[PDB]
Design a protein around this ligand. Structure first.
Ligand SMILES: *[C@@H]1O[C@H](CO)[C@@H](O[C@@H]2O[C@H](CO)[C@@H](O[C@@H]3O[C@H](CO)[C@@H](O)[C@H](O[C@H]4O[C@H](CO)[C@@H](O)[C@H](O)[C@@H]4O)[C@@H]3O)[C@H](O)[C@H]2NC(C)=O)[C@H](O)[C@H]1NC(C)=O
Ligand code: NAG
Ligand code: MN
Ligand code: MN
Ligand code: MN
Lengths: 150, 84, 272, 242, 94
């Protein structure tokens, strides 16, 4: 577990369920941890934003599109990104996040060329320009679990 | 400290123990205290007494038939004591 | 010698005191009261009267029935005209429950509006206003703020306001909270709605909202001049310096009225 | 004249603070009209909130012991289901429990309602269902409720066996171990025990649960009001038998 | 705006602890209508910080008021600043 500060752990990889969904495309292997919790960068929380690790041969990168500044249940704090995954034929990743926006759910798609290139082990909230995402809707759609399967 | 003069003495008053009142739900005891002590050499009265200077109110809760009334009595808890 | 019975003299003086402030001769019946159920609604009343560490007469000796009323949420009327902004904060109340806790405007004794602070650190200054003509706002009081690292509970004596609200049948009232104006914005964090908290816990996020604490005299009570005897009444006494002291070293003044207190004060005497 | 059992399943979740006083006025009122149409009357009680695991509850050390934090407010921790009162004739013991009930909390509006229905149904012993009587189970909650496979997000993939899982504390011990039950599982265990499920929810939740009562045989619905005598009219017109 | 000299203040009261009560008294002339008054203190010889407040009543005769600035005067006798003062503006509606 990386530390945000002294005696202040940044993440909780225990019981993160890494390997709950595995998807492979050619020499690419994508695995995710839907029960990965992450502490907010504003205060001391424990929010299950989910994270994925991608291996394209030698390089291993992290992918947490729900680990953002959009915190709390109202945002992507309980997104559990990587609950379900799949690959397209044009090297785009399809990620499902059932807990986003008070469990309205969200689908996030990023180009594999951008995932590895914009990866930075010192940046915990990476913003991707070619990101495609289902934005938040009205409150009637809460508790819908969009992204449960893909 | 142990004062020989006009000092406010401690006194915890229980409703069930020192009054026998089970009709007051809250509280079931409080610190009203009192002033005891001499005041030697200063006017107005023929004999300067150890009287309280600052007092504090007490909220109580009791029922009226079937209607519970939350009321607050004025000046019950004796904080300070003066001589006048 | 004095003895320790002095404490028992206080207890028996407390006994007759509580009964007199409640205008009661004997304790009421508790066989018409159900043992066990104690609502957390009256526990919030009792907790709010003991809470105030912050904030600044023949009828004033008797007891006052303490009741409170919560405010109106932002889900109905507080968003239709202004909503919330960095310039002001609005709180709204009804009157069908204000004139229900205190039916007659005269019964009202003290009405303090209490809020809930959040950590604010160094300094802020707050000015309070009242709603006039349903559109104009009039100044009330002001208060400087201290660096409380913890949530703080305040109170504002708006008794003169609430009394005027009980005399009119005005079906809607409310307050306004802006900040100081240095002339020749607002940075206070008070417990609000935040607008966006949802889920199961959202319902409890309306608790601790600004409420108006009321202390009135029950309707059941209603109703040297109080004595034919010369009671502990202050007696007249004119003292001259040249006549009663013989001191010619004091030029001014040359006399004043130094009165005195004469009369007994006993208790628990025979015969209600 | 015929024996009748009534189990009172109350939702203690956070959305119930506005509905709390209606339930206590429903308990005492129900603890009076039952002795009228029958003499063999025994009633019980049980409470539920939510499965005490992320993401349904926040996993910060303060919000575990006090899930009403950040408001702030003091409330009971999150628990799956607690069997408090086995059904008995002692009726003032029933009232004394409903009065002292405090609110709990969680995050997600739907609750673990079915977990409490399933444990109260199957446990014919720790609840104490009569041999030949009308096993009536009043279900009260002001929100939706979780069913099967909803616990997959929490990491619970072992299905509900529909058995009696009440520990020495009379709580649902296998709440973080088993999935929520489905309408199929509930239907399969509400008949093996012969239980008539009364849904007593809020207005916005009726259009939902009435379609559940259409699936669940014998299970009916009800509306919650300040005068909770509305739900009493259900039970009295359910003593028709014949 | 009102100003005073510290060279005469620390002569009437040498030690700041000796100061017990220091109330600033003025003189009213206007007798008609009612107005709202705010009081400030001199800081950095340019900035003014809030102090107290008082509403005024339409008295038919010249009225004499007073503002308790004891806590202000006490700190001024400890400082070597030989120039201080006060400011009396009106209400600011914002
Ligand atoms: C109105 O006020 C009354 C009392 O004036 C209040 O009843 C009391 O509520 C407090 C809640 O703060 C109770 O205190 C608790 O006591 C238990 C055991 O005695 C503690 O475990 C509790 O600790 C909590 O907080 C800890 C963190 O500081 C956690 O680690 C822990 O797990 C608990 O979550 C807490 O101190 C007190 O027991 C009751 N009094 C009685 C007689 O029961 C009432 O709730 C108030 N009403 C309101 C606020 O609406
Ligand atoms: C029901 O009958 C069984 C035997 O058939 C018996 O063991 C049990 O005690 C009975 N239950 C009650 C409540 O009488
Ligand atoms: Mn709920
Ligand atoms: Mn509710
Ligand atoms: Mn829930």
């Amino acid at each position: 577990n990386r530390d945000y500060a002294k005696d202040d752990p940044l993440e909780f990889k225990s019981h993160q369920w890494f390997g709950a969904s595995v998807r492979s495309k050619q020499d690419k292997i994508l695995a995710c941890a839907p029960l990965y919790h992450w502490r907010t960068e504003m205060k001391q929380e424990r929010e299950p934003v989910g994270t994925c690790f991608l291996q394209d041969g030698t390089k291993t990168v992290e992918y947490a599109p729900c680990r953002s500044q959009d915190i709390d249940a109202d945002g992507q704090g309980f997104c559990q990104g990587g609950f379900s995954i799949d690959f397209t034929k044009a090297d785009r990743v399809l990620l499902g996040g059932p807990g986003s926006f008070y469990w309205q759910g969200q689908l996030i798609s990023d180009q594999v060329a951008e995932i590895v290139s914009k990866y930075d082990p010192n940046v915990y909230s990476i913003k991707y320009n070619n990101q495609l995402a289902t934005r938040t809707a009205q409150a009637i759609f809460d508790d819908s679990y969009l992204g449960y399967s893909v | 400290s142990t004062e020989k003069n006009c000092c406010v003495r401690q006194l915890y008053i229980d409703f069930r123990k020192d009054l026998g009142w089970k009709w007051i739900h809250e509280p079931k005891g409080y610190h009203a205290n009192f002033c005891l002590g001499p005041c030697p050499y200063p006017g107005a009265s023929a004999a300067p007494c150890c009287v309280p200077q600052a007092l504090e109110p007490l909220p109580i809760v009791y029922y009226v038939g079937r209607k519970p009334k939350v009321e607050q009595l004025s000046n019950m808890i004796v904080r300070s004591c003066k001589c006048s | 010698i004095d003895m320790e019975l002095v404490k028992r003299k206080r207890i028996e003086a407390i006994r007759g005191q509580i009964l007199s402030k409640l205008r009661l001769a004997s304790p009421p019946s508790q066989g018409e009261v159900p043992p066990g159920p104690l609502p957390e609604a009256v526990l919030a009343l009792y907790n709010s009267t003991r809470d105030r560490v912050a904030g600044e007469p023949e009828a004033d000796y008797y007891a006052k029935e303490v009741t409170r009323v919560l405010m109106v949420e932002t889900h109905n009327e507080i968003y239709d005209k202004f909503k919330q902004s960095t310039h002001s904060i609005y709180m709204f109340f009804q009157t069908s429950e204000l004139r229900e806790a205190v039916p007659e405007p005269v019964l009202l004794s003290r009405a303090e509006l209490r809020l809930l602070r959040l950590k604010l650190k160094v300094e802020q200054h707050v000015e309070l206003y009242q709603k006039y003509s349903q559109n104009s706002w009039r100044y009330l009081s002001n208060r400087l703020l201290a660096p409380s690292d913890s949530p703080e509970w305040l109170s504002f004596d708006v008794t003169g306001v609430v009394r005027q609200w009980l005399s009119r049948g005005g079906e809607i009232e409310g307050f306004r909270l802006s900040a100081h104006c240095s002339c020749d914005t607002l940075q206070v964090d008070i417990n609000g709605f935040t607008t966006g908290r949802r889920g199961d816990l959202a319902t409890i996020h309306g608790m601790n909202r600004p409420f108006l604490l009321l202390m009135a005299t029950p309707l059941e009570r209603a109703q040297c001049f109080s004595s034919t005897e010369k009671n502990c009444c202050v007696r007249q006494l004119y003292i001259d310096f040249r006549k009663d002291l013989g001191w010619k070293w004091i030029h001014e003044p040359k006399g004043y009225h130094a009165n005195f207190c004469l009369g007994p004060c006993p208790y628990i005497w025979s015969l209600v | 004249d015929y024996p009748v059992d009534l189990y009172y399943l109350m939702d203690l979740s956070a959305s119930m603070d506005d509905d709390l006083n209606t339930i206590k006025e429903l308990g005492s009122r129900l603890s009076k009209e039952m002795s009228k149409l029958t003499s063999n009357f025994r009633l019980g009680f049980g409470s539920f909130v939510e499965k005490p695991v992320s993401p349904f509850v926040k996993t910060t050390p303060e919000e575990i012991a006090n899930p009403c934090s950040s408001i702030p407010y003091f409330c009971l921790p999150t628990f799956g289901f607690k069997h408090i009162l086995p059904l008995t004739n002692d009726a003032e013991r029933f009232n004394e429990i409903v009065k002292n009930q405090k609110i709990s909390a969680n995050i997600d509006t739907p609750e673990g309602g079915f977990d409490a229905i399933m444990q109260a149904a199957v446990c014919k012993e720790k609840i104490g269902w009569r041999n030949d009587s009308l096993h009536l189970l009043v279900f009260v909650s002001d929100a939706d409720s979780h069913f099967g496979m909803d616990s997959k997000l929490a990491g619970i993939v072992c299905p509900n066996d529909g058995l009696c899982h009440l520990d020495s504390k009379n709580e649902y011990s296998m709440s973080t171990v088993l999935e929520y039950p489905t309408i199929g599982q509930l239907i399969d265990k509400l008949v093996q025990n012969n239980v008539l499920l009364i849904f007593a929810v809020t207005q916005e939740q009726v259009h939902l649960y009435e379609n559940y009562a259409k699936l669940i045989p014998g299970a009916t619905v009800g509306l919650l009001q300040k005068d909770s005598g509305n739900i009493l009219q259900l039970i009295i017109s359910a003593y028709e038998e014949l």
